[PDB]
Amino acid sequence: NYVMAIDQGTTSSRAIIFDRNGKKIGSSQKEFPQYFPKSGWVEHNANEIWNSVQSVIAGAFIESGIRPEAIAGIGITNQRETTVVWDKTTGQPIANAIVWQSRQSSPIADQLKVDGHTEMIHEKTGLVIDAYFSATKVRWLLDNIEGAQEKADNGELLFGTIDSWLVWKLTDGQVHVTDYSNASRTMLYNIHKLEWDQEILDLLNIPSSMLPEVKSNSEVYGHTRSYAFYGSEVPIAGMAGDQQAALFGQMAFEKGMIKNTYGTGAFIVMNTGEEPQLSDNDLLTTIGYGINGKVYYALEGSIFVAGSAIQWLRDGLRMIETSPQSEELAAKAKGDNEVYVVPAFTGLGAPYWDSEARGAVFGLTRGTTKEDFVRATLQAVAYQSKDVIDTMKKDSGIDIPLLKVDGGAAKNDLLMQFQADILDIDVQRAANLETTALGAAYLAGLAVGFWKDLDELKSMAEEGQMFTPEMPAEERDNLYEGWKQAVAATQTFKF
Amino acid sequence: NYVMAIDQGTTSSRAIIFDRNGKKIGSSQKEFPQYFPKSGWVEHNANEIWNSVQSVIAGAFIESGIRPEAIAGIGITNQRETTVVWDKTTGQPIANAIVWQSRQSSPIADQLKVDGHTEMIHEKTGLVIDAYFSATKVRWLLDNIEGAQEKADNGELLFGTIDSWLVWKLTDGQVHVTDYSNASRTMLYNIHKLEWDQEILDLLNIPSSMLPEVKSNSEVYGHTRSYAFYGSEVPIAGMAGDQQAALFGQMAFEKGMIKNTYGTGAFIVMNTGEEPQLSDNDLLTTIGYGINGKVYYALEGSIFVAGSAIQWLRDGLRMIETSPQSEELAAKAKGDNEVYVVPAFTGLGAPYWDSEARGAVFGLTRGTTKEDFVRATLQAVAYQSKDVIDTMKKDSGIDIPLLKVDGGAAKNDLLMQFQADILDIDVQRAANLETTALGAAYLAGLAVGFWKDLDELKSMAEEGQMFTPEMPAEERDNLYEGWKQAVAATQTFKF
């Protein structure tokens, strides 16, 4: 009667039990520790990630009353790029996972750019050389953890993005698999030919004995053998990197269809059908998902720092008491809107890909208030999303009249209205802001035949909220122009 | 037996009684209202300024026990540029005073540059065309206050900077005067020929009937006829703009001696002897003081926003509860000193004179704390003061080995050591940070023979402390590099 989704996020994990109608019948959420050993580094402990996941599985069962034997399948979805390396026999990570947020491995990406590898790597993976992606993280771990390169060389070490790490734990070590969307983010996988790339692996000295089998996004990978499911061998049947799962949960199945998820980072992903579309040094060409013997590619713009800028306001400046306070403060801003925050703490993501940029603020006067400051900080995401979406218009030739939206931070009505005004395009927000987890559930539920099809269409389609652009061209243009100026000035600070 | 100095500053006034040894016997200080009717305007009510001054005169008398008949002369010192225009017969300001801080008349200053007068004004006044100075504020009041141009044309209105206003009020309207230093700030006075400049008055259609008589900085201007001094015709005998009063108070009497006052703004002033130095269009050539028949000139770099950045923290961001708290927060910063705050809310002052720049922040990361942000905001003034002092050693061939410092904010020992460190120059620090009020009292006391001469020397020089540069070249150069980047980037945001 139900499908469980596990959504293993950057700051928290969640498990959600959905029924045949696509409705939430049970759920549990648990934060886990974030580690910053040096500025610019972000790590997680993959065991503490795994316990967070055990906790929410058990929690969703405990609170709902539902037991494992009622679950038709499990979908898994996850913060992408984040890299685990673990000993195959003891199942222990050789060190902390390194988060997609981290830039600890940036020297290794810099050297790759120095040695001339840009276009080769972009033509195989669709990606920009950067420490965002898993390849340099696996190289970092092989360079810096004593003994590890030799073990990997001896076949004793496994690599996994978090999806892979989860299925391995959930099967108690039986299955080492990743799906095409997560593999496409490692910068080790050739997204054209659909295989791990030997040349990139030899170049970074990564033995291929580390690597999981890659499979589609909707098939039974294996069955649980695990405490919180115990005794049921529940099929693990749906897997996608979170931003692709969101793309899926949006039903963005046709070429051109685009969503943005507003969370710790924000990720604009457009389905480009069964063929990949050309790059530049601006968007990423990536894999949406593989299902029904077909692979759908996607174009993506990545905005690394979005809701985590709010967390900085809370934690770093202590300007706000909690993160929900940002929305109240910002609603109360009285300034002309001439302050701009460009919270690019770790570098600017799409369409700039400038790793050396850091966060900056512009247009401050003696009248600037806490409220003005918080609002500017929120609006950065909507402006950079425009940067992205206009680039995708240019790169796609595809005019875009509808942006679908989801993610915890999409709950802010004024932000969503600003986003539509600034874009001059309609913005439709999902009823259930966790379409990430729904997308994983849909993939799992199709695999095990809980749902027969994609055209069990928007059968289920509860969702609505439409934000229609109501800002005149003049205002919208002056706003965006100040943003572009702020970004160009941010880029000139290269100390 | 005693001298009183009145220091009418930007946010408060103060009155100090000093004995013949220069010691403080009594003081009183009192804030008065600040008005900001539009973003970038700053105004005072001149009547409120006058009541704040009667208030602090009375308080110094009440708290010291000294009485007006025991006061040998009065010195007067004031926020400069700040412009008051009044009716000679009612005594009433035609409108709010317009503060040196405001830029409301900046369209007037732009049109003067457009019309090609920059070199003419600079040659005559030593100054850069800007709405910082009194000239465009008078023109603004004559543009904007109904009927005032015709009254001024009819000889019915008087202009004065705040020294001139307080002497008018203290003598019950019998004396309309200003000293060389304050008049040098108006951009209406020719500091070479030592007269009001007729060509500049015609250009700005300001009638000479508005203008006070311009006199030396140490002579009997008149006598009080006023409540707080009632029954004593107390000699009013010393007057300088607050910053030239600081230079005097510090005994920087010789060519090359230089001070910095850390106050609301920060203003570095070097005595250039009896000739001017050549300025760049990057420093101001101004009058330091006229005494003993001679006129001493000065070079100055003005930094508009220094301690007012810290009031912005308090009142705009509410990042700090009180201004003093800044010191504590910054002392506690653990970041690597890579955040820069360029708090140029009203434009950049010297050496930039960029009226379009606004406040900006750079180098922010997830680890930036309140304490780092506060510390960067405090260090701005030290970095800009080095821009200025380097410019000055550049325009005048001469190493500067010692900067004397005063002002409220020089009480911050860490900011002073940082100041010395990044300069590689010794920094002294006056024993009494009210060297402004001291320099005024000196000027009044020389004039009435209370002290006989300048070489009643350093006789009284009661003082030092000392901050010796102790940061290596590598560290200072990197700190500074990052500051020049941040300002270059701030000047690129020209939205």
Any CB–CB contact under 8 A between A338 and chain B? yes
Are A57 and A143 members of one domain? Answer: yes
Is residue B225 a known part of a binding site? no
Residue B142 token pair: 């004559």
Domain end call among B207, B233, B250: B250
- The residue of B312, B366, B368, B371 whose CB has the most chain A CBs within 10 angstroms, and thus the best one to mutate to test that interface, is B366
Are B246 and B329 members of one domain? Answer: no
- φ, ψ of residue B492 to 5 degrees: the values are -80, -15
Q: What is the DSSP secondary structure assignment for residue A93, as one 8-state letter? A: B
Contact between A363 and B316 using a beta-carbon 8 Å cutoff: no
Tell how far CA B409 is from the center of its chain: 14
Q: How many CB atoms lie within 10 A of CB B338?
A: 18
The CA distance from B409 to the nearest CA of chain A, in Å, is: 19
Q: Which of A343, A40, A355 is nearest to B364 (CA)?
A: A343
Q: Which of A238, A149, A139, A150 is nearest to A187 (CA)?
A: A139
Q: Which of A134, A246, A122 is nearest to A182 (CA)?
A: A134
Domain end call among A200, A234, A250: A250
Are A233 and A302 members of one domain? Answer: no
Contact between A364 and B346 using a beta-carbon 8 Å cutoff: no
Q: What is the DSSP string of A17-44?
A: EEETTS-EEEEEEEE--EE-SSTT--EE
Q: Sign of the CA dihedral A182, A186, A191, A196?
A: negative
Are A183 and A327 members of one domain? Answer: no
SS3 (DSSP) at B185: coil
Contact between A495 and B485 using a beta-carbon 8 Å cutoff: yes
Q: At what angle do helices B473-492 and A473-492 cross, to 10 degrees?
A: 160
Q: Which of B164, B214, B166 is nearest to B189 (CA)?
A: B214
Tell how far CA B483 is from the center of its chain: 24
Tokens 């994609």 belong to residue = A454
**One-letter amino acid identity for B135?**
A
Residue B289 token pair: 């003081």
Of A370, A482, A492, the CB nearest to B489: A492
Q: What is the DSSP string of A356-415?
A: T--EEEEEE-TT--HHHHHHHHHHHHHHHHHHHHHHHHHHH-----EEEEESGGGG-HHH
Contact between A40 and B365 using a beta-carbon 8 Å cutoff: yes
* B301: β partners: B268
Contact between B362 and A490 using a beta-carbon 8 Å cutoff: yes
Closest residue of chain B to A494, computed from CA coordinates: B485
Of A308, A368, A492, the CB nearest to B492: A492
Residue B179 token pair: 């000293």
Residue B374 CA to residue B332 CA, distance in Å, equals 10
Contact between B367 and A343 using a beta-carbon 8 Å cutoff: no
Residue B177 token pair: 């005067």
Check: CB of residue A205 under 8 Å from CB of residue A277. no
Are B224 and B261 members of one domain? Answer: no
Q: Is B146 left (phi over 0), alpha (psi -120 to 50) or beta?
A: beta
Tell me the H-state helices in A176-237: 180-184, 198-203
Q: What is the DSSP secondary structure assignment for residue A354, as one 8-state letter? A: B
Residue B19 CA to residue B450 CA, distance in Å, equals 10
Contact between A495 and B488 using a beta-carbon 8 Å cutoff: no
Any CB–CB contact under 8 A between A220 and chain B? no
Q: Which of A455, A488, A473, A440 is nearest to A162 (CA)?
A: A440
- Domain with residue B382: its CATH number is 3.30.420.40
Residue B165 CA to residue B453 CA, distance in Å, equals 28
Are A243 and A307 members of one domain? Answer: no
Structurally, how many domains does chain B consist of? 2
- The residue of B320, B364, B372, B477 whose CB has the most chain A CBs within 10 angstroms, and thus the best one to mutate to test that interface, is B364
Contact between B492 and A495 using a beta-carbon 8 Å cutoff: no
Residue A382 token pair: 């909507």
Which secondary-structure segment (H or E) carries A466? Answer: strand A466-467
Are A233 and A381 members of one domain? Answer: no
Is residue B436 a known part of a binding site? no
Contacts of A363 in chain B (CB under 8 A): 358-359, 493, 495
Check: CB of residue B294 under 8 Å from CB of residue B41. no
- The residue of B43, B362, B477 whose CB has the most chain A CBs within 10 angstroms, and thus the best one to mutate to test that interface, is B362
A381 CB-near residues (< 8 Å, 6+ apart): A262, A266, A303, A306, A309, A409, A415
Is residue B115 a known part of a binding site? no
B324: preceding bond cis by omega (within 30 degrees): no
Any CB–CB contact under 8 A between A432 and chain B? no
Of B338, B358, B492, the CB nearest to A364: B358
Residue B449 token pair: 């023979």
Q: What share of chain A is helix, strand, coil (3-state, %, to 5)?
A: 35, 25, 40
Which secondary-structure segment (H or E) carries B294? Answer: strand B294-303
* A359: β partners: B364
Residue B113 token pair: 């540059």
Residue B276 CA to residue B387 CA, distance in Å, equals 21
Are B229 and B283 members of one domain? Answer: no
Contact between B363 and A312 using a beta-carbon 8 Å cutoff: no
User: Interior CA angle at B430 toward B424 and B436, to 5°?
Assistant: 115
**One-letter amino acid identity for B421?**
D
Q: At what angle do helices B46-64 and B162-170 cross, to 10 degrees?
A: 60
Are A233 and A124 members of one domain? Answer: yes
Residue B289 CA to residue B454 CA, distance in Å, equals 13
Residue B411 CA to residue A238 CA, distance in Å, equals 65
Any CB–CB contact under 8 A between B193 and chain A? no
Instruction: Give how far Cα A119 sits from Cα of A125, A185, A281, B279, B307, Å.
Output: 10, 16, 9, 53, 51
CA end-to-end distance (rounded Å), chain A = 58
Which secondary-structure segment (H or E) carries A142? Answer: helix A134-144
B365 CB-near residues (< 8 Å, 6+ apart): A39, A40, A345, A346, A358, A359, B338
Check: CB of residue B229 under 8 Å from CB of residue B57. yes
Of B336, B361, B492, the CB nearest to A488: B492
Is residue B132 a known part of a binding site? yes
Any CB–CB contact under 8 A between A373 and chain B? yes
A312 CB-near residues (< 8 Å, 6+ apart): A343, A345, B366, B368
Long-range contacts of the stretch A270-278 (C-beta < 8 A, 24+)? A270/A298, A270/A299, A270/A300, A270/A392, A270/A396, A270/A398, A270/A400, A271/A247, A271/A296, A271/A298, A272/A296, A272/A297, A272/A298, A272/A299, A272/A396, A273/A297, A276/A126, A276/A191, A276/A192, A277/A395, A277/A396, A278/A395
| CA dihedral of residues B85, B91, B92, B96 (deg, nearest 10) | 40
Contacts of B487 in chain A (CB under 8 A): none
Check: CB of residue B2 under 8 Å from CB of residue B66. yes
Contact between B39 and A361 using a beta-carbon 8 Å cutoff: no
Any CB–CB contact under 8 A between B463 and chain A? no
Q: At what angle do helices A370-396 and A413-423 cross, to 10 degrees?
A: 40
Are A471 and A453 members of one domain? Answer: yes
Q: Which of B235, B209, B217, B72 is nearest to B148 (CA)?
A: B209
Any CB–CB contact under 8 A between A38 and chain B? no
Contacts of A361 in chain B (CB under 8 A): 359-361, 364
Any CB–CB contact under 8 A between B354 and chain A? no
Check: CB of residue A358 under 8 Å from CB of residue B364. yes
Of A312, A370, A482, the CB nearest to B317: A370
CA end-to-end distance (rounded Å), chain B = 58
| CA dihedral of residues B99, B102, B104, B110 (deg, nearest 10) | 110
Check: CB of residue B401 under 8 Å from CB of residue B435. no
A99 CB-near residues (< 8 Å, 6+ apart): A10, A42, A43, A44, A79, A81, A82
Residue ranges making up the domain that contains B270: 251-495
Any CB–CB contact under 8 A between A37 and chain B? no
Is residue B10 a known part of a binding site? yes
**One-letter amino acid identity for B471?**
M
Q: What is the DSSP secondary structure assignment for residue B142, as one 8-state letter? A: H
Residue B302 CA to residue B262 CA, distance in Å, equals 11
Which secondary-structure segment (H or E) carries B165? Answer: helix B162-170
Instruction: Give how far Cα A380 sits from Cα of A200, A243, A356, A404, B362, Å.
Output: 35, 20, 18, 19, 15
3-state secondary structure string across B437-455: HHHHHHHHHHHCCCCCCCC
Q: Residue B146: exposed, middle, or buried by beta-carbon count in 10 A (0-12, 13-18, 19+)?
A: exposed
Are A85 and A185 members of one domain? Answer: yes
Check: CB of residue A378 under 8 Å from CB of residue A310. yes
**One-letter amino acid identity for B3?**
V
Contacts of B375 in chain A (CB under 8 A): none
Q: What is the DSSP string of B332-369?
A: T--S-S--EEE--BTBB-TTT-BTT--EEEEEE-TT--
Q: What is the DSSP string of B460-484?
A: S------B---S-HHHHHHHHHHHH
Long-range contacts of the stretch A12-16 (C-beta < 8 A, 24+)? A12/A52, A13/A49, A13/A52, A13/A53, A13/A55, A13/A56, A14/A56, A14/A434, A14/A437, A15/A53, A15/A56, A15/A57, A15/A59, A15/A60, A16/A60, A16/A434, A16/A437, A16/A438, A16/A441
Domain end call among B214, B234, B250: B250
Instruction: Give how far Cα A363 sits from Cα of A278, A376, B103, B384, Å.
Output: 36, 10, 16, 19
User: At how many Å resolution was this determined?
Assistant: 2.0
Check: CB of residue A411 under 8 Å from CB of residue A448. no
The CA distance from B91 to the nearest CA of chain A, in Å, is: 32
Q: Which of B259, B262, B265, B263 is nearest to B244 (CA)?
A: B259
Tokens 């003891």 belong to residue = A90
B68 CB-near residues (< 8 Å, 6+ apart): B61, B224, B228, B229, B230, B231, B232, B234
Are B245 and B256 members of one domain? Answer: no
Q: How many CB atoms lie within 10 A of CB B98?
A: 26
Contact between A373 and B318 using a beta-carbon 8 Å cutoff: no
A307 CB-near residues (< 8 Å, 6+ apart): A262, A263, A264, A265, A266, A323, A407, A408, A409
- φ, ψ of residue B393 to 5 degrees: the values are -65, -45
A107 CB-near residues (< 8 Å, 6+ apart): none
Closest residue of chain A to B477, computed from CA coordinates: A495
Which secondary-structure segment (H or E) carries A247? Answer: helix A242-249
Q: What is the DSSP secondary structure assignment for residue B253, as one 8-state letter? A: -
Q: For the CA atoms of chain A, what is the radius of gyration?
A: 22
Any CB–CB contact under 8 A between A227 and chain B? no
Long-range contacts of the stretch B474-481 (C-beta < 8 A, 24+)? B475/B421, B476/B421, B476/B422, B476/B424, B479/B337, B479/B383, B479/B422, B480/B383, B480/B386, B480/B422, B481/A495
